[PDB]
Structure formats: C-alpha cells, structure tokens
Amino acid sequence: MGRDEAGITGTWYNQLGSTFIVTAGADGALTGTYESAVGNAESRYVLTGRYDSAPATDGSGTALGWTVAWKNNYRNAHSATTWSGQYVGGAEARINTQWLLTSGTTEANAWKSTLVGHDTFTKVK
Amino acid sequence: MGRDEAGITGTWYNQLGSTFIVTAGADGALTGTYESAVGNAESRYVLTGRYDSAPATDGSGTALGWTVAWKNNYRNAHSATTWSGQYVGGAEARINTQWLLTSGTTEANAWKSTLVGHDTFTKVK
Amino acid sequence: MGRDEAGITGTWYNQLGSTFIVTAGADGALTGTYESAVGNAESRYVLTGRYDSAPATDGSGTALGWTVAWKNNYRNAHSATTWSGQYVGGAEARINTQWLLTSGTTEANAWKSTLVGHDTFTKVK
Amino acid sequence: MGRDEAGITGTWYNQLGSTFIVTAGADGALTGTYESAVGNAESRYVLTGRYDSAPATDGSGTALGWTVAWKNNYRNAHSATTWSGQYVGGAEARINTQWLLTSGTTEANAWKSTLVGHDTFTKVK
Numbered sequence A, B, C, D: 001m002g003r004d005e006a007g008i009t010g011t012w013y014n015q016l017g018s019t020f021i022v023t024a025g026a027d028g029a030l031t032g033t034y035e036s037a038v039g040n041a042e043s044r045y046v047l048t049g050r051y052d053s054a055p056a057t058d059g060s061g062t063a064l065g066w067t068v069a070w071k072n073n074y075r076n077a078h079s080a081t082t083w084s085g086q087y088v089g090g091a092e093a094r095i096n097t098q099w100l101l102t103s104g105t106t107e108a109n110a111w112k113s114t115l116v117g118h119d120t121f122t123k124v125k
C-alpha cells in the first residue's frame, strides 16, 4: 500500500467550504468527487489524480495533484481546475495546494483563460 | 462520445521534446503516459485527468487538465505536476497549458515547493 | 491623495516572518524595502510597485503589486520576485498576494526558472 | 552601469501586440509605460520594476519584474499585473515572463481575483 494511502483517503474541506472526497490507491491513483462551495458549480464532479506512493522519510510532505472538469449532469462551466500540492500528516493533517482553473475560450480571449489560487484542505470543518 | 474525444486521443509533443500519450473517454476521462525530456525523470509515468466532453460550440477551446506523479519503476522525484489548459482543434491542433510542479518539502522549505510554467503541445515534432 | 494611501503606507509582516516596508504615493507609486526571512537573502532590498489609487467603493479590495530584485550590497541571488494582490482594509487590514520568483537560468534550465507561492501580510507580528 | 542596462532599455512588443517601453537604471531600477492590446485598457500606463544589474556570467538570463496598476487618465480597471521573468540577450533578445493579474474583489469573490499567463517580449513586431 502507499505510505500515506490511509492518510489521504477520506473527506477533506477547504477554506471556501468545498468538499473533496478521495480514495488513494496503493499504486498512486487518486479517485473521487469534488463539490465546490463557489463558482459555476452544483453538486459533485468527478476527479482523478496521482500521488507519490513512496514519499521521502525525512519529514517532507507527499506530493499529489488532481483534476476536475466542471461538467456533470447538472451544469457545464466549460472549465477545468487542477490542484497541485502536498499532503502533510500529523495531528493536524493538511493538503496544501495551489491551483489553475482554465476556461475554454476563443483565441482572442485566451490571455484571460486561467485563474490561479491556493486552497488548504483539512479533515475538519 | 466526447465532442473532441477523437481530437485529443493520441500522441502529443511539447516544446521541451516531452511526449504525452493520452486516451480521452466518452465521459471526460483522460488516461495515458508522460515522458519528460527534462528534469528528474526517465521513461514513462502514469497520468490521469479530465476534459470537458461537451464544450461550447462558439469557437471556444476545450478545457482539460491532467496530473503526473513523478514516481515509476525507475525513479521517484517526490513531486507531481498538474497541467491545466485547453485543446484547440483545427489544421494545427494544439493543447495550450500552464502547469504547477509541487515537490514534497519540509515545512521550512514549503515556500519554494512549487514551480510554475507553460507547455504547448502539438501533434507533430 | 490615494484612497488607501494611508492604509497601505507602513510596515507589513507575512506568514514567513518577512518584513515589507512601503510608502504609497498619491499617484499610485509604491516604494520601500523588503527583508525576507527565508531564501538566499540578507538585510533589506529595494522594492517598487504600483497600486490603484482610486479603487471601487463597493467593498472591493485595492489592487496592487511590487517587485524585488534580490541584489543588494550583501548578496545577489540572481532572481526577482513580483507580488500581485489586493489590500483589504478594516480592523484586520491585510494584503493578500500571490507571487512569482524567477531566477536567471540557462536556456536549458528555463523550464525550472519560476517558483509560485502566496503571501498574506498583516500589520502585526 | 548595469550589465544589461543597455540591452533592456527600449521598446518591447509581446505576442498580443502590447508595447512595453522601459528604461533600466544603473542601480536596478525599471521605469516606463505599458500599452495593452487587450483587456480593459487604453493608451499608456505607468510601470515600475527592478532587474538584476549584475547577473551571472555563465550564460544565464537576467532576472527582472515590473508592475502596472491599470489606472490612468482614461480608465480604471481596478487591477494590477506583475510580470516576473528574465531577459535573454543575443541576436534575438527576448524577455520571457509569466504574469499575475489581480483585480480588486469583494471577499466573496477573492477566489477568482487572479489571472495567470505568460508573455514573451521581443524587440521587433
């Protein structure tokens, strides 16, 4: 199994009130659903990603990332967000991320296609 | 099937000489392998992502993203890259991306954990 | 004078323990010094930037940005950081930023030239 | 004088057709005007920044950054862009940048306050 397979698997909440439900596979797979508290989004969206299943043992975090395309049976916001970050274990486990949200645009509007931000996920709240 | 399922599926090359091999699913899934021409990487790595399988019909691109965790049977660079961008069809199809590469770090080094960059993928070269 | 000229001018501290000393001009100028608690840096470095001297009056923040080139009389880290963000007034005034740190590189290493991160500045601590 | 003071000073054009007019000071100062071909912008805006006035001599680029607040006598877009990048000399001199465009927002909209992108500047076109 992945070193932090058990630590990552479960339900996570970020500072916006969004909910990230993920299962970590022994190989490095991440699968689950994402529910955003903000934006052009309703209910759950499929997510898939990857994590380092054998991280360093020197106190470093565990690198990971995942993607949501903002289309489900209710809405399509013609956009995708990728979160890139690291999982930090301990009494107050966290996933610290930065993210890129690209919207499909015309070529004329490509310069304003991508938002950047940062989300911190915790196991409570 | 996804509107650009056929357009996205296949082999892609970026400006660094890296190779991105992907299969787009009818639902929005992306699966494949990534081979980086630079960095602490050798051979192919698993990737997984998502794309908008029903994009706008007004000339906008198709939003997508995917993740590579840089661990395979040869190396582990304790890091993950996510690419966020859009697919643009036509005679010269392109996937235009920006990316975030997060390395697992100690808490003291978290401020320098994440590189940002941009890759353009084409079907030739 | 700028609407938040008085609110921005002064000494600010971020979550790393760095110190940002700035004077806002009536026109939109920002001038001052930056002292980083981390990285290849010692003592104060010149900074210069710009802010919106007539922001919206609807409760929106005040957009601003500034640059430090990491050369002073003690060290040269061959790099520059730009912070882009917004000033938020009130009892707990804050400057919320994201930043890009580019190092001079060879062309072969340009893909790993730029770190991205986020700093929050407060008037205390 | 700065090692690339003469190389940086002058008029630069990016891929959008915007015009960047800058003077590099011997100390590391950058001053000038920016005219954007896209967005909520008309005519010239003040810019100020910093560059490494004594870069490495090993073939590395020269790190630099600058800021524009998008207010002038014609318009105010309540936003600021910072470009962070490096100057590369030679027959085809370039300034390769990534940028962050933050708009003043309410706290509820802060998650969508910042665009990210990349501009390449050349001395022709």
Ligand SMILES: O=C(CCCC[C@@H]1SC[C@@H]2NC(=O)N[C@@H]21)NCCCN(CCc1ccccn1)CCc1ccccn1
Pocket: A014, A016, A018, A035, A036, A037, A038, A039, A040, A041, A070, A077, A078, A079, A081, A099, A101, A103, A112, A113, A115, A117, A119, D111, D112
């Ligand atoms: O909301 C979405 C899907 C939801 C995205 C939620 C984000 S993921 C990062 C973060 N962490 C989180 O938990 N939740 C947020 N996708 C289109 C994102 C359109 N713009 C902004 C929102 C909006 C809502 C309605 C109408 C127009 N926009 C993108 C910014 C932009 C740039 C240029 C022109 C227009 N818009």
Ligand SMILES: O=C(CCCC[C@@H]1SC[C@@H]2NC(=O)N[C@@H]21)NCCCN(CCc1ccccn1)CCc1ccccn1
Pocket: B014, B016, B018, B035, B036, B037, B038, B039, B040, B041, B070, B077, B078, B079, B081, B099, B101, B103, B112, B113, B115, B117, B119, C111, C112
């Ligand atoms: O190379 C990797 C895996 C390969 C990543 C390849 C990138 S994906 C984005 C881009 N598009 C592409 O096709 N290919 C590149 N992951 C660790 C990335 C360590 N640093 C830089 C490289 C390195 C190689 C050897 C020793 C040290 N580093 C990250 C930057 C950093 C910050 C602070 C301290 C140290 N390093």
Ligand SMILES: O=C(CCCC[C@@H]1SC[C@@H]2NC(=O)N[C@@H]21)NCCCN(CCc1ccccn1)CCc1ccccn1
Pocket: B111, B112, C014, C016, C018, C035, C036, C037, C038, C039, C040, C041, C070, C077, C078, C079, C081, C099, C101, C103, C112, C113, C115, C117, C119
């Ligand atoms: O430290 C600096 C100057 C200090 C920068 C301080 C940052 S500004 C953003 C943040 N907010 C803050 O208050 N403080 C920090 N500039 C070179 C930054 C070299 N790398 C990482 C540090 C380092 C220290 C010693 C030896 C090597 N690196 C950049 C990452 C990288 C990528 C690839 C290869 C190598 N390094």
Ligand SMILES: O=C(CCCC[C@@H]1SC[C@@H]2NC(=O)N[C@@H]21)NCCCN(CCc1ccccn1)CCc1ccccn1
Pocket: A111, A112, D014, D016, D018, D035, D036, D037, D038, D039, D040, D041, D070, D077, D078, D079, D081, D099, D101, D103, D112, D113, D115, D117, D119
């Ligand atoms: O245009 C501006 C000023 C011009 C900025 C020009 C950019 S600098 C980076 C790049 N290189 C360049 O040479 N030129 C461009 N500042 C507000 C930028 C508002 N949004 C997008 C544009 C817009 C125009 C009219 C009405 C609404 N927007 C920001 C994206 C966003 C996110 C969420 C909600 C709404 N908008």
Ligand SMILES: [Cu+2]
Pocket: A055, A056, B076, B078
């Ligand atoms: Cu190891």
Ligand SMILES: [Cu+2]
Pocket: none
């Ligand atoms: Cu806008």
Ligand SMILES: [Cu+2]
Pocket: A076, A078, B055, B056
């Ligand atoms: Cu639609």
Ligand SMILES: [Cu+2]
Pocket: none
């Ligand atoms: Cu370094």
Ligand SMILES: [Cu+2]
Pocket: C055, C056, D076, D078
């Ligand atoms: Cu206004």
Ligand SMILES: [Cu+2]
Pocket: none
């Ligand atoms: Cu490295």
Ligand SMILES: [Cu+2]
Pocket: C076, C078, D055, D056
């Ligand atoms: Cu040197």
Ligand SMILES: [Cu+2]
Pocket: none
């Ligand atoms: Cu929008």
